[PDB]
Design a protein around this ligand. Structure first.
Ligand code: CDL
Ligand code: UQ
Ligand code: PLX
Ligand code: PLX
Ligand code: PLX
Ligand code: PEE
Ligand code: PEE
Ligand code: PEE
Ligand code: PEE
Ligand code: PEE
Ligand code: UQ1
Ligand code: SF4
Lengths: 175, 156, 98, 70, 71, 83, 318, 115, 105
């Protein structure tokens, strides 16, 4: 019940997801995905994952810049659609909002199995760690272990990135 | 009265701010714009008075009509005058913009830009010297020092 | 599970549903794909942080890498489709039938 | 000027002085005058929490020395 | 020394919770006081919802987000 | 040995940036294997005590383990103070 | 007490931006054999106040064809982000102390580009659109190399914490160890702030007012303030990163004075560079950043990874 | 909490500046004043028409090169491991692979803009 | 299907990251290290079918550690009864549950 900050952030996450899933326009969809990336960074930050949250926010900012350029080039029309400019987009948006609100009320006032399992709430502070040790960040040590433990992961990842460059060059060649 | 004193002081402050920060459009037509550039040149340095050219009409406060206005050009001049946010001022520079000048009797020339837009100051000459245009700009500043907007609003 | 887990899973389901129902633009479906990737990143990060699994802190980075590869692939295909038709509408991809 | 450019630079320098000095003084005023503690890791946070508990006034900055151990 | 006093603090909080729950939960019929939820009989680290479950929300907030929000 | 020298001169005359980049990259690749202080860096990394050293139970058959931190047994950091 | 600190940070920054406008005008004037502002107020000391009062008493226009929500959101985002990017800077103590300050600046700066993107798109005019796509291209040009340069420089710091940079350079400036990286970083910060010779988005000769051409009055003013605050902030970051001031814990005023002097010198260098050079073509900026800067940056990153290991000079704080 | 307060303060100040800018001055809006600016003549088409991207291939390469930045950022912490020979081999392997990808795209004219 | 190349050559390509109880850097332990260790040891070498029945206790303890469902159930029951008692006015919570304690280091 403590300030409900994580619950509010996750609700805004879901709202941004509904925003871009209704597919109003690519320009608007990218804005919704940016908002979702920001609140997800916040959610991960509130759990001790500063590096991962900042990293995912930076990555999605770059991706959405490329997507904005591509939308201006290849996904435009005379009247771009907003969430209130079309009955289909508005209906999908309102349906998503109402589904989210219904699920929140359903799981908050009752203690019911939606699909997988049940949940009573209490705020996500309960399952925390009360761990008292360290001159280092455990997340940072785990991520840095990629260069000593994750040799195989580094190999496959680097190979896949090089292959991706070659692949995009082959795909866009045309002829 | 207290209200009269307050509105007079506020009017003074607003007028000072407006006249000390006068941004003309980057806009010239003919011979007179060369003298405009010489007014922007180091010897006269209009920027030292707070006068800075800006290209966009939405960021401009004054329009200097510097050169002949032809019939083909008049709709464009009117259009960029309409797109200036208010308050806005127009300065007519040179004989051509004043009343047509050397081309007053031509078939393709507007006989003075004041047929198309309202004009605040007329600068005579063909072309007026950069010093004369500076005098006209300072005269426009002195005219802006004299307006009573808040006092007239209070008197309503 | 807490409420945050249900919220993240709901976000994943919404993005999947978004991908499944196509409107006109291909780019919107690509955005839904990226949204699913982001939801999976958030869920995995929360699970790994909660259980203090130190060596698993590096998996979401790998997930992001392959998400970038997938997005690049989709964007290249979109470039080709648009060059063919002058539009990224999924209605134009109807030359092959069942 | 060329020395008439200097007054604007001096005003800018005075403006830019304010944030750092203000932050230093406000840190000192709210931490007993002794340079607000830094906790980049959980061990330092635990030390700060322990200090707060034993102070008796619920403030980490108040320090109990050898006079508190009879 | 920190380890010793942390052990004492955790044990004291657990004992206080045990006594207060024994006072509270005597009304209901079939509630064994202090009953564990694990089949094993070895020591298990408290979940911090078990140490701060009966305390004010300021203490809970400081115990959960105190280190994260200290900047 | 004669054509490659001319190639080097041409590259220096046309693409100095690439010449500098390749030289720096090659130096960074090959130098660390020829340096005597790489093992020194490894030892310094191994000497940083991030966690608590849990003591061992005395079974009476470990002459090499000190019974006190200031005893002569155990490892030494005297090599580090001279570095 | 914390709100007092926020205000004591954000108000002086706005005053510094206002007077940086005047300082830039005077420096450009004197490098051009003229004077610059010297009438409204002694030595043009009241010119910024007159400019601000004129702008905020001028009519704001909402274009008929424009998206209004994004059109209004973009300048708010610009100004708020410019203000926020100041809070982790240690002067010598930061307002907000972060474990990863550098990554925070990276993320917030890469978010700041959407101000230009969205203002240009939401204006619904052609010059604004051209400015916005130039912004896209500029970010694609500078981002990767900027990040790699930051990593290479920070490999000697030991962490991402900004305050550790003070103790790292306790004896020598970091510019004596990484001056090629310093040069590439300086050019990258010029490109990142849309400053000449990389002021492509505004494109005054080429694109009239570019991305902000539709904007007028108070909304226009916000964009200007954000840009100049970004100038000062990036130069302060450069001063902290490469010319490290010495900090006495019992006299932080000396550090503050020295750091402010250094960042003022870097800002004056920005103005000098603007006064001295012509503008790039925006494909040429991308070619410079991808064909000259990127290979050298990769090689220097390899070198700066190897060097501490070879010399047993690895920094602390894993 | 402090960072949230800072964000709220900055956003509030910017919003208040916009509010003052829009409610203080005198507004006189009419159709000519609010029409799109194209140097004094009416635009031919719409600004919402497709705008070609000549550097599309470099933009996709930016997506892949950006993710290798996320792989290289943990390097300052990776330098503190005991097995410095494995880590240094892997850091150079990733950077060599990234330089090879730039060399491939450069030689195949992938960096040249479309005409 | 599964070619155990790792087992045949003794390579350990990915086994290092499969479980939470396997050699973390700096010996940082997982939150449920003991439970997973006991479940693994109990089920080792008896096969999957036998393990699902004869190591059900250890697995149940491990899952309880992982998700902590019974713990929140018990805590919420205790708090509900306490709130019911205070609402009718028959508890009078102790001073150390209201912030007026005497803290120890
Ligand atoms: C349930 C939750 C619902 C959430 C609602 C979202 C907030 C927007 C509500 C008001 C906007 C609509 C007003 C309007 O259209 O004109 C009014 C009115 C109408 O003008 P008109 O000329 O008569 O006709 C215009 C036409 O109708 C046509 O006008 P148009 O073309 O401009 O319409 C487009 C507009 C119309 O809106 C709609 O179509 C439906 C609204 C639903 C949008 C929600 C989509 C989800 C997006 C992601 C989640 C966002 C947060 C939501 C959660 C809220 C709780 C915190 O849609 C938008 O632009 C959405 C922008 C809002 C998102 C703000 C996010 C900021 C991003 C910053 C970076 C992020 C960093 C990382 C974090 O004109 C005005 O009064 C001036 C403009 C008003 C702008 C005010 C400021 C912008 C909106 C506030 C943003 C709040 C952020 C916090
Ligand atoms: C080569 O020609 C050119 C120039 O040279 C002559 C220029 O200067 C120039 C730049 C434009 C100048 C005229 C500068 C204009 C000055 C600003 C637009 C005014 C901004 C000043 C305020 C908005 C700052 C904030 C106002 C307050 C007084 C600060 C405190 C804030 C409170 C909350 C407290 C351009 C584009 C140019 O092209
Ligand atoms: C039979 C056919 C052979 C040829 C085909 C090979 C196909 C796969 C490509 C590469 C083979 C993979 C084998 C290497 C697996 C990595 C793990 C192993 O080698 O041990 C590591 C040893 O690392 C060594 O450096 C070897 C790796 C060197 C990699 C060189 C690059 C080869 C990749 C080239 C092909 C990949 C695709 C093409 C991209 C260039 C770690 O040792 P260590 O750290 O002590 O112990 C770790 C445990 N700790 C943490 C408790 C301490
Ligand atoms: C709190 C933030 C919001 C408000 C910001 C307000 C900023 C402070 C105001 C700045 C005051 C300075 C302006 C006055 C300087 C003018 C100097 C003097 O020369 O002015 C003379 C007289 O000035 C005017 O008559 C009056 C100016 C001031 C009017 C009264 C002051 C009101 C201050 C109240 C501030 C409250 C703001 C509202 C708050 C909501 C006219 O001379 P001028 O023509 O120039 O020069 C001729 C050129 N020569 C010399 C080369 C030959
Ligand atoms: C730097 C940031 C922080 C600064 C801190 C101050 C922030 C100030 C808040 C931002 C707004 C500043 C604008 C100031 C000018 C006033 C604008 C508006 O509020 O006034 C009128 C608001 O009035 C409304 O029009 C109707 C009158 C009041 C509506 C009744 C609502 C019920 C209130 C109860 C009133 C009873 C007595 C109140 C005392 C208890 C609007 O008139 P309008 O012409 O359109 O707009 C143009 C204004 N002009 C004329 C100056 C050009
Ligand atoms: C002072 C009087 C108060 C009146 C309040 C009116 C508010 C309003 O919406 O009106 C719209 C008003 C006036 O328009 P007109 O009707 O055309 O002219 C009025 C003159 N007669 O227009 C505006 O100025 C809108 C102001 C912006 C709204 C402020 C809040 C916006 C919130 C933005 C959140 C997103 C921030 C993005 C960055 C943050 C990310 C970290
Ligand atoms: C936009 C995204 C904002 C990102 C904020 C990041 C702040 C940050 O990195 O500071 C981390 C800081 C301290 O962490 P460490 O430095 O690792 O050490 C602390 C322990 N000694 O962590 C925190 O303070 C967390 C506080 C809350 C997290 C931030 C939540 C902000 C979320 C913004 C959502 C936007 C509002 C919703 C609508 C958006 C658009 C309308
Ligand atoms: C970012 C830094 C700067 C922040 C902005 C702060 C600026 C503060 C300066 C205050 C100066 C006073 C404002 C004067 C201009 C007001 C608008 C104006 O001039 O319009 C004149 C207008 C014309 O009216 P009419 O004659 O009846 O109609 C004719 C049209 N048919 O007259 C008025 O409306 C006067 C009304 C007084 C406006 C209120 C001024 C009070 C001060 C508010 C300051 C806001 C700070 C918060
Ligand atoms: C050995 C370790 C390697 C790792 C370190 C290097 C790190 C990253 C550096 C490589 C990045 C990618 C390389 C890019 C390859 C460019 C290919 C190319 O096309 O080259 C031409 C230029 O032609 C060249 O190839 C340049 C010369 C040949 C390559 C440069 C030198 C190669 C190595 C020479 C030095 C070797 C080591 C130095 C020894 C010093 C001797 C004492 C580019 O010019 P254009 O853009 O096409 O011009 C068009 C306008 N008319
Ligand atoms: C013992 C082991 C040491 C390892 C080796 C270390 C030594 C390495 C020596 C070489 C380092 C050189 C670094 C320089 C990086 C860029 C060099 C470069 O070539 O860039 C230029 C481009 O660089 C520029 O021209 C800059 C453009 C923008 C100019 C803006 C104003 C100039 C800046 C004024 C002074 C800046 C001061 C920087 C530092 C400030 C303090 C931080 C290439 O462009 P072109 O000539 O057109 O040719 C490319 C195709 N053939
Ligand atoms: C440097 O600032 C100036 C301009 O902005 C680029 C101008 O356009 C002009 C007008 C001359 C050009 C060719 C339009 C002048 C005089 C000027 O000083
Ligand atoms: S008035 Fe004279 S100088 Fe000016 S434009 Fe006309 S002819 Fe040329």
């Amino acid at each position: 019940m403590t300030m409900y900050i994580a619950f509010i952030l996750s609700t805004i996450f879901v709202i941004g997801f509904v925003g871009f899933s209704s597919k109003p326009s690519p320009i608007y969809g990218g804005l919704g995905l940016i908002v979702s990336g920001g609140v997800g960074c916040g959610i991960v930050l509130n759990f001790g994952g500063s590096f991962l949250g900042l990293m995912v926010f930076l990555i999605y900012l770059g991706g959405m810049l490329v997507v904005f350029g591509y939308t201006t080039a290849m996904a435009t029309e005379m009247y771009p659609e907003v969430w209130v400019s079309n009955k289909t987009v508005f209906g999908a948006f309102v349906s998503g909002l109402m589904m989210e609100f219904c699920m929140v009320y359903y799981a908050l006032k009752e203690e019911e199995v939606e699909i997988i399992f049940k949940f009573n709430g209490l705020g996500d502070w309960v399952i925390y760690d009360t761990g008292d040790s360290g001159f280092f960040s455990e997340e940072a040590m785990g991520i840095a272990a990629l260069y000593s433990y994750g040799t195989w992961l580094v190999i496959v990842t680097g190979w896949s990135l090089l292959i991706g460059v070659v692949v995009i060059m082959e795909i866009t060649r045309g002829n | 009265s207290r209200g009269e004193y307050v509105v007079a002081k506020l009017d003074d402050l607003v007028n000072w701010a407006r006249r000390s920060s006068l941004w003309p459009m980057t806009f010239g037509l003919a011979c007179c714009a060369v003298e405009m550039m010489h007014m922007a040149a180091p010897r006269y340095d209009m920027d030292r008075f707070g006068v800075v050219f800006r290209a966009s009409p939405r960021q401009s406060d004054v329009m200097i009509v510097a050169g002949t206005l032809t019939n083909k050009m008049a709709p464009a001049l009117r259009k960029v005058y309409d797109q200036m946010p208010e308050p806005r001022y127009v300065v007519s520079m040179g004989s051509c913009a004043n009343g047509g000048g050397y081309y007053h009797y031509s078939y393709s020339v507007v006989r003075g830009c004041d047929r198309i837009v309202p004009v605040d100051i007329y600068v005579p000459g063909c072309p007026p010297t950069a010093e004369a245009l500076l005098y006209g700009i300072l005269q426009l500043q002195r005219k802006i020092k004299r307006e009573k907007r808040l006092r007239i609003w209070y008197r309503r | 599970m807490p409420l945050v887990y249900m919220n993240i899973i709901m976000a994943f389901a919404i993005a999947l549903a978004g991908l499944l129902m196509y409107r006109s633009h291909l780019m919107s479906s690509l955005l839904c794909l990226e949204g699913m990737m982001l939801s999976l990143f958030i869920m995995s990060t929360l699970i790994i942080l909660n259980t203090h699994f130190t060596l698993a802190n590096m998996m979401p980075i790998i997930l992001l890498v392959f998400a970038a590869c997938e997005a690049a692939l989709g964007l290249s295909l979109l470039v080709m489709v648009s060059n063919t038709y002058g539009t990224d509408y999924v209605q134009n991809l109807n030359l092959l039938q069942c | 000027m060329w020395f008439e450019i200097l007054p604007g630079i001096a005003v800018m320098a005075a403006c830019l002085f304010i944030p750092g000095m203000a932050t230093a003084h406000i840190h000192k005023f709210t931490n007993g005058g002794k340079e607000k503690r830094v906790a980049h890791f959980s061990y330092q946070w635990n030390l700060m929490e322990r200090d707060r508990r034993i102070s008796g006034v619920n403030r980490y900055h108040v320090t109990k020395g050898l006079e508190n151990i009879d | 020394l920190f380890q010793a006093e942390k052990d004492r603090r955790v044990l004291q909080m657990l004992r206080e919770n045990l006594e207060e729950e024994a006072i509270i939960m005597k009304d209901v019929p079939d509630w064994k006081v202090g009953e564990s939820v694990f089949h094993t009989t070895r020591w298990v680290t408290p979940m911090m919802g078990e140490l701060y479950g009966l305390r004010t929300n300021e203490e809970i907030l400081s115990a959960t987000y105190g280190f994260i929000w200290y900047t | 040995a004669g054509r490659i020298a001319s190639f080097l001169k041409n590259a220096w005359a046309k693409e100095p940036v690439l010449v500098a980049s390749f030289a720096i990259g090659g130096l960074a690749i090959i130098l660390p294997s020829l340096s005597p202080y790489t093992n020194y860096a490894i030892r310094i990394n191994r000497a940083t005590p991030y966690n608590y050293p849990v003591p061992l139970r005395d079974d009476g058959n470990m002459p090499d383990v000190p019974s006190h931190p200031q005893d002569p047994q155990g490892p030494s950091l005297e090599w580090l103070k001279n570095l | 007490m914390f709100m007092i600190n926020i205000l004591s940070l954000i108000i002086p920054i706005l005053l510094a931006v206002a007077f940086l406008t005047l300082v830039e005008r005077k420096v450009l004037g004197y490098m051009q054999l003229r004077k610059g502002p010297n009438v409204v107020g002694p030595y043009g000391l009241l010119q910024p106040i007159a400019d601000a009062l004129k702008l905020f008493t001028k009519e704001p226009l909402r274009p008929a064809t424009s998206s209004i929500s994004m059109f209004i959101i973009a300048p708010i985002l610009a100004l708020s982000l410019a203000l926020t990017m100041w809070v982790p800077l240690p002067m010598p103590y930061p307002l907000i102390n972060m474990n990863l300050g550098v990554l925070f600046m990276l993320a917030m700066s890469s978010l700041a580009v959407y101000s230009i993107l969205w203002s240009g798109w939401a204006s619904n005019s052609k010059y604004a659109l051209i400015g916005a796509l130039r912004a896209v291209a500029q970010t694609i040009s500078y981002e990767v190399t900027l990040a790699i340069i930051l990593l290479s420089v920070l490999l000697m710091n030991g962490s991402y914490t900004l305050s550790t940079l003070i103790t790292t350079q306790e004896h020598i400036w970091m510019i004596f160890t990484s001056w090629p990286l310093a040069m590439m970083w300086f050019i990258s910060t010029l490109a990142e702030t849309n400053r000449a010779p990389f002021d492509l988005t505004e494109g005054e000769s080429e694109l009239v007012s570019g991305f902000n051409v539709e904007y007028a009055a108070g909304p226009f003013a916000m964009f200007f303030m954000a840009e100049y605050a970004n100038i000062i902030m990036m130069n302060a970051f450069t001063a902290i990163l490469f010319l490290g001031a010495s900090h006495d814990p019992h006299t932080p005023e000396l550090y503050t004075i020295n750091f402010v002097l250094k960042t003022l010198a870097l800002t004056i260098t920005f103005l000098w560079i603007r006064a001295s050079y012509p503008r790039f073509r925006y494909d040429q900026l991308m070619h410079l950043l991808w064909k000259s800067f990127l290979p050298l940056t990769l090689a220097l990153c390899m070198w700066h990874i190897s060097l501490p290991i070879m010399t047993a000079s690895i920094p602390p704080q894993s | 909490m402090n960072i949230m307060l800072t964000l709220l303060t900055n956003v509030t100040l910017a919003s208040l500046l916009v509010l003052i800018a829009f409610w203080l001055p005198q507004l006189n809006a009419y159709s000519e004043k609010t029409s799109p600016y194209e140097c004094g003549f009416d635009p031919m088409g719409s600004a919402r028409l497709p705008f070609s991207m000549k550097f599309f291939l470099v933009a996709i390469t930016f997506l892949l090169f950006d993710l290798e930045i996320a792989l290289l950022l943990p390097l300052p912490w990776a330098s503190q491991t005991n097995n410095l020979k494995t880590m240094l081999t892997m850091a150079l392997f990733l950077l060599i692979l990234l330089a090879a990808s730039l060399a491939y795209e450069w030689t195949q004219k992938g960096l040249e803009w479309a005409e | 299907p599964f070619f155990d190349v790792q087992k045949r050559l003794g390579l350990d390509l990915d086994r290092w990251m499969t479980i939470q109880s396997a050699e973390q850097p700096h010996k940082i332990p997982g939150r449920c290290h003991a439970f997973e260790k006991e479940w693994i040891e109990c089920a080792h070498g008896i096969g999957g079918i036998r393990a699902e029945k004869e190591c059900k206790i250890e697995f149940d303890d491990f899952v309880e550690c992982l998700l902590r469902q019974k713990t929140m159930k018990r805590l919420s029951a205790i708090k509900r009864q306490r709130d019911k008692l205070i609402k009718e006015g028959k508890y009078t919570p102790p001073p150390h549950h209201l912030g007026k304690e005497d803290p120890r280091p």
